[PDB]
PDB file of C-alpha atoms in Angstrom:
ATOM      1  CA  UNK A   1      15.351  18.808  18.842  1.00 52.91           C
ATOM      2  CA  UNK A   2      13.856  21.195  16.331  1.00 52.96           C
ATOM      3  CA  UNK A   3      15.452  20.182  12.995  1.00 55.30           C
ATOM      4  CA  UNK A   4      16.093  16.725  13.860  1.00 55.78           C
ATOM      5  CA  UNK A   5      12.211  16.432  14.813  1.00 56.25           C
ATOM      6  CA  UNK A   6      11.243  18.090  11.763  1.00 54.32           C
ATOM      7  CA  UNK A   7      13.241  16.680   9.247  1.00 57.14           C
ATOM      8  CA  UNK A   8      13.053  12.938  10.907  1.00 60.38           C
ATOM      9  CA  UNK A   9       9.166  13.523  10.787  1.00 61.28           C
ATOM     10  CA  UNK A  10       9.022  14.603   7.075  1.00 64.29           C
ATOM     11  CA  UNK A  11      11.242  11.722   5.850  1.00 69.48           C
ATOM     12  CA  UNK A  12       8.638   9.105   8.300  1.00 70.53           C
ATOM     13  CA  UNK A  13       5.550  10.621   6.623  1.00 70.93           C
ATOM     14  CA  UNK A  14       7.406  10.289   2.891  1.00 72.29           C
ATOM     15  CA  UNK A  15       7.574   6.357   3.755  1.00 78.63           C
ATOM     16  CA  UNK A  16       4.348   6.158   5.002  1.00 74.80           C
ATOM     17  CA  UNK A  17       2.800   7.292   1.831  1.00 75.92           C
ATOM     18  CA  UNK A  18       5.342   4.652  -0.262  1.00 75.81           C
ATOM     19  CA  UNK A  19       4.064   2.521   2.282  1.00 77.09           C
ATOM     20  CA  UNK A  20       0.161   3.159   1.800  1.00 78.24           C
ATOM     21  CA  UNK A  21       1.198   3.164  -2.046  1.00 81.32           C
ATOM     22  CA  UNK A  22       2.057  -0.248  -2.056  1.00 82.96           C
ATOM     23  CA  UNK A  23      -0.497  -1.152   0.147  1.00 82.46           C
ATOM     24  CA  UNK A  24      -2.921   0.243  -2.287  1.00 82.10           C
ATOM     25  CA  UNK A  25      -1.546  -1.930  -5.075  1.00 77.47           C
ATOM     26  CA  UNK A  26      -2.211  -4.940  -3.715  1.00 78.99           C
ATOM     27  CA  UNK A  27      -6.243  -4.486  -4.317  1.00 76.73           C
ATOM     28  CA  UNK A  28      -7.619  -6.715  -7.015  1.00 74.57           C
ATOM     29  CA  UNK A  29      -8.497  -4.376 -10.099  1.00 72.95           C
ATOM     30  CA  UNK A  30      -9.180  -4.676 -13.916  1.00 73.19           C
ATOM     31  CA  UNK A  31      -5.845  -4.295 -15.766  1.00 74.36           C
ATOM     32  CA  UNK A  32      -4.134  -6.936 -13.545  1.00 74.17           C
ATOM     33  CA  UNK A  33      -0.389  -6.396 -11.620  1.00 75.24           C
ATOM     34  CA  UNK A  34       1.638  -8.148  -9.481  1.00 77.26           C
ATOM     35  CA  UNK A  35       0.893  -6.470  -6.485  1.00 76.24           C
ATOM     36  CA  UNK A  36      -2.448  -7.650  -6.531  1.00 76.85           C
ATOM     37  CA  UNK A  37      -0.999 -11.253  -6.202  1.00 71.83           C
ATOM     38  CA  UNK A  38       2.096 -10.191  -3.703  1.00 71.66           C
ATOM     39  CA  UNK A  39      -0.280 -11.167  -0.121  1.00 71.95           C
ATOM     40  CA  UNK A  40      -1.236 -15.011  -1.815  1.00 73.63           C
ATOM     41  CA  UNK A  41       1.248 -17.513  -0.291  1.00 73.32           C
ATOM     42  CA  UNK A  42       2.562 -21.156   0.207  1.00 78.46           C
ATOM     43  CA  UNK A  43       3.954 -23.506   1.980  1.00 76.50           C
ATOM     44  CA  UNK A  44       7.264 -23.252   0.376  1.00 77.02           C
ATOM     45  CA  UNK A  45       9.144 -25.901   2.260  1.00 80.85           C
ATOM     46  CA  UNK A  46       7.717 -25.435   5.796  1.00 81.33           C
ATOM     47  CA  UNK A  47       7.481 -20.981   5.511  1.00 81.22           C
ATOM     48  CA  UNK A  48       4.806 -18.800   4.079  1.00 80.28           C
ATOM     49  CA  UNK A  49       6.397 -17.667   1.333  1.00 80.35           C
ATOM     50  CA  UNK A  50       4.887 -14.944  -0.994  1.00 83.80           C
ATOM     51  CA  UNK A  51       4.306 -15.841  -4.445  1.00 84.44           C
ATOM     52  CA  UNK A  52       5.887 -13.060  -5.615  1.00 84.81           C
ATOM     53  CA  UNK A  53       8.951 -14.462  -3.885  1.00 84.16           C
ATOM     54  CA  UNK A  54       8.379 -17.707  -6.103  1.00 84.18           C
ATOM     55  CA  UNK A  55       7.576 -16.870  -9.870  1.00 86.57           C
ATOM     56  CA  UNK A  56       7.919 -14.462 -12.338  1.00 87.28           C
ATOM     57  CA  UNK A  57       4.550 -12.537 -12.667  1.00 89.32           C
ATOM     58  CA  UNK A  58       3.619 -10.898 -16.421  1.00 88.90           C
ATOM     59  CA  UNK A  59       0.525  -9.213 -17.433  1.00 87.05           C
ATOM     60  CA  UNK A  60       0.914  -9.566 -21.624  1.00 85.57           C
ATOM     61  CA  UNK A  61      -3.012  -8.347 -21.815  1.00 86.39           C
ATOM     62  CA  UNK A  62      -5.466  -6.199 -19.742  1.00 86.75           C
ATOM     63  CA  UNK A  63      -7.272  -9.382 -18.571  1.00 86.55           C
ATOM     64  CA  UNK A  64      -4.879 -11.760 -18.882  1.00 88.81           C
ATOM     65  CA  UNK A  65      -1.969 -12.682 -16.238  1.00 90.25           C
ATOM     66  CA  UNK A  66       0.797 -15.176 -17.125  1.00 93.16           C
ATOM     67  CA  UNK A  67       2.996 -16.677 -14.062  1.00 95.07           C
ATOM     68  CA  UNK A  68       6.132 -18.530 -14.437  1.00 96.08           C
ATOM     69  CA  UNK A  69       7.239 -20.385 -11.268  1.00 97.90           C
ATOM     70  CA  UNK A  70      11.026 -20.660 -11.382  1.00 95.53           C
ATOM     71  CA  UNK A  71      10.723 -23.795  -9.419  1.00 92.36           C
ATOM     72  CA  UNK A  72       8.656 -26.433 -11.657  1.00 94.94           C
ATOM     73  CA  UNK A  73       7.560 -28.743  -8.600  1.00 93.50           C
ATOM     74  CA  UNK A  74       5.857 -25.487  -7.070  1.00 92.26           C
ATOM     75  CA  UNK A  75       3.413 -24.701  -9.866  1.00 93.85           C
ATOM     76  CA  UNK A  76       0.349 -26.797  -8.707  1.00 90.06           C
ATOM     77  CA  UNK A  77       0.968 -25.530  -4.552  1.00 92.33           C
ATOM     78  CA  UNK A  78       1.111 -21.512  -6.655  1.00 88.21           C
ATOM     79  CA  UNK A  79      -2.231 -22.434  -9.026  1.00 88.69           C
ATOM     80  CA  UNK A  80      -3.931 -23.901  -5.892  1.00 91.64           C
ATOM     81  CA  UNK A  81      -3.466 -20.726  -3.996  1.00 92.71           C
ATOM     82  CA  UNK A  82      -3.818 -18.668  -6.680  1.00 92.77           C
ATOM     83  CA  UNK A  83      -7.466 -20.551  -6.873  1.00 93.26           C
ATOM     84  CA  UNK A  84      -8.199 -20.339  -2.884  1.00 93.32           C
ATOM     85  CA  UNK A  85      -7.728 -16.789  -3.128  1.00 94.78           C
ATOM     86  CA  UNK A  86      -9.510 -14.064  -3.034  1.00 94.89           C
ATOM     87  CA  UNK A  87      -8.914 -12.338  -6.413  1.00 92.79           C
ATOM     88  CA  UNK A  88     -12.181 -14.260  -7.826  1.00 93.99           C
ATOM     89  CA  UNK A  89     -10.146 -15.742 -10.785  1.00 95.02           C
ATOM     90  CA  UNK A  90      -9.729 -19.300 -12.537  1.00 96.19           C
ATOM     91  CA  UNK A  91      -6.321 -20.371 -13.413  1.00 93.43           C
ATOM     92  CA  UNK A  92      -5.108 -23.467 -15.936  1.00 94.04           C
ATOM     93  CA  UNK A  93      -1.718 -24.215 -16.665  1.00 96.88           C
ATOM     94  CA  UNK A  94       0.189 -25.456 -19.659  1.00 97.40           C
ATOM     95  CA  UNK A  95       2.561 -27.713 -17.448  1.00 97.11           C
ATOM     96  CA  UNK A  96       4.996 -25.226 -17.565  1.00 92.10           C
ATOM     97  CA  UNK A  97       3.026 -21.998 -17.252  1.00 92.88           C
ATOM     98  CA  UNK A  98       0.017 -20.690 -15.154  1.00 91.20           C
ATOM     99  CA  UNK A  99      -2.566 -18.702 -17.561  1.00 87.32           C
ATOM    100  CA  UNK A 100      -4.822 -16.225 -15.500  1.00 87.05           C
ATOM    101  CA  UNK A 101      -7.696 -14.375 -17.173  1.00 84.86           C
ATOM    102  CA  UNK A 102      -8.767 -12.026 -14.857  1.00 85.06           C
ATOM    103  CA  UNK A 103     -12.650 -11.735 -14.811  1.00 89.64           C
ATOM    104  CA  UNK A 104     -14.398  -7.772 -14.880  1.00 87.35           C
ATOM    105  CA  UNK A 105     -15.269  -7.309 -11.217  1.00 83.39           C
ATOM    106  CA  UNK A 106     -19.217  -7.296 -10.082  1.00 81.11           C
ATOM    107  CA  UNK A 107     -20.576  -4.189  -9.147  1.00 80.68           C
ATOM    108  CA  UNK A 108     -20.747  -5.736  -5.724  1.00 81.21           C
ATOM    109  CA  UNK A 109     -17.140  -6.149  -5.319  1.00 83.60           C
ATOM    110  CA  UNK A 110     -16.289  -2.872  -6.727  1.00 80.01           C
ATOM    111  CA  UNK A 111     -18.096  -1.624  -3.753  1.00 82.62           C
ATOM    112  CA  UNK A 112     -16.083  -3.840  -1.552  1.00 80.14           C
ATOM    113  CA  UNK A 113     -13.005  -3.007  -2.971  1.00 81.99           C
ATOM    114  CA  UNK A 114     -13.432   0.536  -3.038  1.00 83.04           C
ATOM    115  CA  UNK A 115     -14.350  -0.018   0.803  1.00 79.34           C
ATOM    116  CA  UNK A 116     -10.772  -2.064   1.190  1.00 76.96           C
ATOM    117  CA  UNK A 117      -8.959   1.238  -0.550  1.00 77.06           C
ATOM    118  CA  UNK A 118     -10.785   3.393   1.783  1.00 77.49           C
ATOM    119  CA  UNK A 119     -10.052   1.907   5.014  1.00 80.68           C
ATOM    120  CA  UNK A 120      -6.060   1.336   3.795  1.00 80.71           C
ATOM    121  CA  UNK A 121      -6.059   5.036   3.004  1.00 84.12           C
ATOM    122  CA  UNK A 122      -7.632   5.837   6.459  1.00 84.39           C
ATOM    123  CA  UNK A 123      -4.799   3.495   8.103  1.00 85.61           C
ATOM    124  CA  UNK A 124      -1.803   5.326   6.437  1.00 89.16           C
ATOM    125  CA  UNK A 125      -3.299   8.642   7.452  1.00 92.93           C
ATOM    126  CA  UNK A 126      -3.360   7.677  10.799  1.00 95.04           C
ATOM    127  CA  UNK A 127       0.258   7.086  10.690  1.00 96.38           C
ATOM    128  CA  UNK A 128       1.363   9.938   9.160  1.00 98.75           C
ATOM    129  CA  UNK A 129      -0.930  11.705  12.207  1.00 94.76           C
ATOM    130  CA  UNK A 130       0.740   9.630  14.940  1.00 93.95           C
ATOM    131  CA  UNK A 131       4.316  10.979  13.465  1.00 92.37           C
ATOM    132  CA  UNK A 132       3.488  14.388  13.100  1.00 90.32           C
ATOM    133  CA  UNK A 133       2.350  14.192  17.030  1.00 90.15           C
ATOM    134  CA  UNK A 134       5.191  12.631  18.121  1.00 87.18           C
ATOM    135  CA  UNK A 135       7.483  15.292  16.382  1.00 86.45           C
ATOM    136  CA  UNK A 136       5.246  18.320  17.699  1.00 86.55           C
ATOM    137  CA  UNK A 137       5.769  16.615  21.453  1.00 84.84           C
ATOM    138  CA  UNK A 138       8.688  17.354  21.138  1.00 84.80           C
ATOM    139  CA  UNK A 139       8.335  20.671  19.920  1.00 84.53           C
ATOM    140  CA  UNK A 140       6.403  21.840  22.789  1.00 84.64           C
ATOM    141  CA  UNK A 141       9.294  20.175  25.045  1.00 85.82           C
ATOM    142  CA  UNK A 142      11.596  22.198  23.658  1.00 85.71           C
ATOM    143  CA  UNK A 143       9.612  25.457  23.615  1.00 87.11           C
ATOM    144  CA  UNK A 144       8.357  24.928  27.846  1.00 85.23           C
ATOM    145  CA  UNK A 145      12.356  23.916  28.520  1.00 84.52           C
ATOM    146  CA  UNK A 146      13.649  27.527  27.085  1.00 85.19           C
ATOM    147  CA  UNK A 147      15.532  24.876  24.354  1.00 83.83           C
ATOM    148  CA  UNK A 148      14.941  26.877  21.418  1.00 80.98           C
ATOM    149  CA  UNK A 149      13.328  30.820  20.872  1.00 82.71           C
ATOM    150  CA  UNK A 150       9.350  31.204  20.578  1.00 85.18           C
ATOM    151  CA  UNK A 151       9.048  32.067  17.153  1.00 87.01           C
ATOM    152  CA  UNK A 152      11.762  29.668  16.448  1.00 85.23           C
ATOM    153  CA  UNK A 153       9.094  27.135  17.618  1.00 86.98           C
ATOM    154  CA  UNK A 154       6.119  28.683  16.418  1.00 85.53           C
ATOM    155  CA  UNK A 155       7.293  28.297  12.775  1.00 85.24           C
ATOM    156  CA  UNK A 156       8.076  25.169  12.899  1.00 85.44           C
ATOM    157  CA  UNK A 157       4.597  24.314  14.335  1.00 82.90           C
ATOM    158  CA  UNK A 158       3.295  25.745  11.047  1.00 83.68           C
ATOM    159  CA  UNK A 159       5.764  24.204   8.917  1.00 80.85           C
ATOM    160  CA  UNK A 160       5.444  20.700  10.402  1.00 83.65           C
ATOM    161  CA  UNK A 161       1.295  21.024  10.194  1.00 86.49           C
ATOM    162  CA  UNK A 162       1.986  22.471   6.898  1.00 86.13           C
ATOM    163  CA  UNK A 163       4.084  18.680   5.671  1.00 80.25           C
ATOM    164  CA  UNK A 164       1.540  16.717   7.556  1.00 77.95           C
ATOM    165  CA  UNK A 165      -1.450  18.262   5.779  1.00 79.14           C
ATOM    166  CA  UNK A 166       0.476  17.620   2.740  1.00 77.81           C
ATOM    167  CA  UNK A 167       1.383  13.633   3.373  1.00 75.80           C
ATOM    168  CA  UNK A 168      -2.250  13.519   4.474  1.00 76.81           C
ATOM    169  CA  UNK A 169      -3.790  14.577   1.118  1.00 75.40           C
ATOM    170  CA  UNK A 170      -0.999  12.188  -1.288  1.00 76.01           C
ATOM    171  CA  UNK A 171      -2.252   9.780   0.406  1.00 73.77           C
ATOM    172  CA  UNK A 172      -6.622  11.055  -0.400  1.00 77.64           C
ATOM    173  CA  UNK A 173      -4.953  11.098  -3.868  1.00 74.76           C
ATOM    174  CA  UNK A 174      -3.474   7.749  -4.035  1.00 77.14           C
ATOM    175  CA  UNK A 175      -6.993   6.548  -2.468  1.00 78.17           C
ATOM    176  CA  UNK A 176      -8.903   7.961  -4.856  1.00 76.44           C
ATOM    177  CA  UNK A 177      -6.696   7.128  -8.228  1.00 72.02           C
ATOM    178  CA  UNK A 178      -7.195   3.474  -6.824  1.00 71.70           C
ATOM    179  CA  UNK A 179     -11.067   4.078  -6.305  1.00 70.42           C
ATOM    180  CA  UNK A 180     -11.284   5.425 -10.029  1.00 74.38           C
ATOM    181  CA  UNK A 181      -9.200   2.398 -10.914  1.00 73.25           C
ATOM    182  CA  UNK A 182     -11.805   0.641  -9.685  1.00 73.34           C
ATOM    183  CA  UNK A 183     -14.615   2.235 -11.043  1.00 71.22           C
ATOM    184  CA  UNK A 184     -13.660   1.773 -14.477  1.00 70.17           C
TER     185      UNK A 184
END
C-alpha cells in the first residue's frame, strides 16, 4: 500500500547501496584494506571460512599489510591463500606475523579492475531498479483497484522515481571514487 511501498522501497535501495559499498571495497587497490582480503578463505576445520573471520588485518603503511592470525596453527593455511590469491602479492612471515607489501598495480590490471568496479556498480543498480519496480507494481495496483486517489498515486510515482534516480547515481559515485582509487 502506498506508504508502506514507498517507504519499504527507499529503506531496500539504502541497503543496496551499503551493499554495493562493500562490494566495492573488496577490489584490490594501492593503499591496501581489509576488504580487499575479506573474499580469500580456508579450510578452517572442514568450512570456508573468511580470513577476515580468522586474523586481525592492519595496514601500518600505504604498501604494506600486516596480518595477525589469532589462531597460531592457521598462519601457513592464511599465507598460502593469501599467496593463491588473486591480489598479485608475496607474503613472508615472522613465525608469528604475516608481512604483506602490496605491489603498485600494472596498467593492465588497473584496466581490469576498473572493469570489476564497473560491472559491481552495474549489478547494484540493477537491484535498486528491480525494487523500485516492484514498489511501483504495486502502485499501479492500488491506483486500477480505486485503493488510493489519482494524484495521491501520481505523486508518489514521482517521488519513488525521484529516490530511485537518487540510489542509482550514489551508487555511479561510489563506482567512480573506486575507479579514481584505482587510477592513482
Amino acid at each position: 500500500m502506498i506508504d508502506e511501498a514507498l517507504f519499504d522501497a527507499e529503506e531496500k535501495m539504502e541497503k543496496a547501496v551499503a551493499v554495493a559499498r562493500d562490494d566495492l571495497s573488496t577490489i584490490r587497490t594501492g593503499r591496501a584494506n581489509p576488504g580487499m582480503f575479506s573474499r580469500i578463505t580456508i579450510d578452517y576445520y572442514g568450512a570456508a571460512t573468511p580470513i577476515t573471520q580468522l586474523a586481525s588485518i592492519n595496514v601500518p603503511e600505504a604498501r604494506l599489510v600486516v596480518i595477525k592470525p589469532y589462531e597460531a596453527n592457521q598462519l601457513r593455511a592464511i599465507e598460502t591463500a593469501i599467496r593463491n590469491s588473486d591480489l598479485g602479492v608475496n607474503p613472508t612471515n615472522d613465525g608469528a606475523l604475516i608481512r604483506v607489501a602490496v605491489p603498485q598495480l600494472t596498467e593492465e590490471r588497473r584496466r581490469e579492475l576498473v572493469k570489476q568496479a564497473k560491472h559491481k556498480g552495474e549489478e547494484a543498480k540493477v537491484s535498486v531498479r528491480n525494487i523500485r519496480r516492484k514498489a511501483m507494481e504495486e502502485l499501479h495496483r492500488i491506483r486500477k483497484e480505486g485503493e488510493a486517489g489519482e494524484d495521491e498515486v501520481g505523486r508518489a510515482e514521482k517521488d519513488l522515481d525521484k529516490t530511485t534516480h537518487q540510489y542509482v547515481t550514489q551508487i555511479d559515485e561510489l563506482v567512480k571514487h573506486k575507479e579514481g582509487e584505482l587510477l592513482e
